[PDB]
Amino acid sequence: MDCRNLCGAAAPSRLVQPGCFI
């Protein structure tokens, strides 16, 4: 009824940026 976690596991957060869009 209350649940947890062990490892961070937040490693992949691949931020993307606007390429040369024209």
Add this chain to the structure above:
Amino acid sequence: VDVNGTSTPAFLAQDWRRFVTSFPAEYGEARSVMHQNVFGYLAAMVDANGRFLFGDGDLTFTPDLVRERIRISNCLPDPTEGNTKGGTGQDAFAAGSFVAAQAA
């Protein structure tokens, strides 16, 4: 916009200026609302040269939005879903996603 023949959707600063200038001026002062993700995706625009379209040469772009008639928010639909959906491959904005608004 097109890329390698594919026509995935996108968003350009030109379109932003077009939208903000398209307001009927005689109505009156109309401010705008948008997410910080959108303003970041905008201030990080790079031309074909490699230059920042804004704040060229100071590693950051920070104009007073009050002068630029922009109020910011953070629980708007945030079209850059989780700040990860810019779009060159599988990161397209998924056309049909709110971007910003403007009103008096």
Add this chain to the structure above:
Amino acid sequence: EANYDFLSFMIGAAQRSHRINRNQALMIGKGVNEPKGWLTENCFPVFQTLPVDVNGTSTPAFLAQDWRRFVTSFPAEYGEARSVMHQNVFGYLAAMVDANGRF
């Protein structure tokens, strides 16, 4: 005798060692007998830039756009955030060059 005072020398190069090891620990302290370094704790939101394909290589890299976004993408509702990195990385940033050749 031996005029050079060893006592003060050690009294100095004990606090210096203590301080440098304290900083090293609080940065990357590995659990046991080392205060947990926020690097190895690894619960921070970590963003990794996607690589660039130079003549079909998909080589990892890092350009100023990613840095400017990573600085601006900070939620302002938290408040003022400062950035920390190496001076090598700072010189690397100051050494950036466009396709035409300008800094």
Add this chain to the structure above:
Amino acid sequence: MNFNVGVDFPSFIAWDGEESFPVKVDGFNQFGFTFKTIAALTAATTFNIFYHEPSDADPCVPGPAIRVPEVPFCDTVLLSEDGLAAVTLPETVTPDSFCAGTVPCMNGQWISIAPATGSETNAANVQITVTMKGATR
């Protein structure tokens, strides 16, 4: 500077994937639950709580396994169709995440957990153990 925490809060196996185990809870006065999986689940899983009474043949061995009725709190919106106590592990739990639970009303001297029928497939990958709090003697 860890303390020996076998002299306080001693844990005991309850469900090692395929075998239930009645643990004595008399000397103790509080007890919870830890659910840990060794693999990923397939569908949601449910586990039925049971309790034992001292069989007349010997006061220090559990008798049969009698059902435990869940007692409702305030502000309740639903009740198990029978009123019987049972817990559920939801789907999408990764096998590096313990999960907590606790019955609010004891009964008997040995608590036990059993895989609810129709959900014993994932039960193998599930392991439930119990810790307690008090000695009282």
Add this chain to the structure above:
Amino acid sequence: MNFNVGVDFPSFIAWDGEESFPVKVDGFNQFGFTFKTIAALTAATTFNIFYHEPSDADPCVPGPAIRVPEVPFCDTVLLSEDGLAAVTLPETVTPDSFCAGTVPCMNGQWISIAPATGSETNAANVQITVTMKGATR
């Protein structure tokens, strides 16, 4: 009025009498051991202890079982064969009788317990668990 004690000292299985399992304690700061005997033994049951380190392949998976070193203190005058932390449940221990153990100095990421060579058949009737304490993650 048993508090929900799953959180606030949970715990996991360490040795089910058949196989070992390294239980992450790196996210914790204090911990200890709880043994349990299910049947009468035959002789002193020795158990080797080991600590693990994160595999370079994945920081959330055990590596090998490096040998935890026995550490002495004030009156420790009975060191082992140069010092290798390992415990021994003595004989004359009936069932429904748990024991307590701990390691004074933590090392690595998680711990593991194995039946010492020669105590395996006796270890077949023992169940060992580990219980943590307090941690902030």
Add this chain to the structure above:
Amino acid sequence: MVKLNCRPLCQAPTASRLVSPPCFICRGVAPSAP
């Protein structure tokens, strides 16, 4: 308890390289072709 102490006679120099951030590249341009 004789404590040793040793120093070298001739020192060798130390060279190194100075690799620098490469050309600006585009990780995807809009007007392109397959």
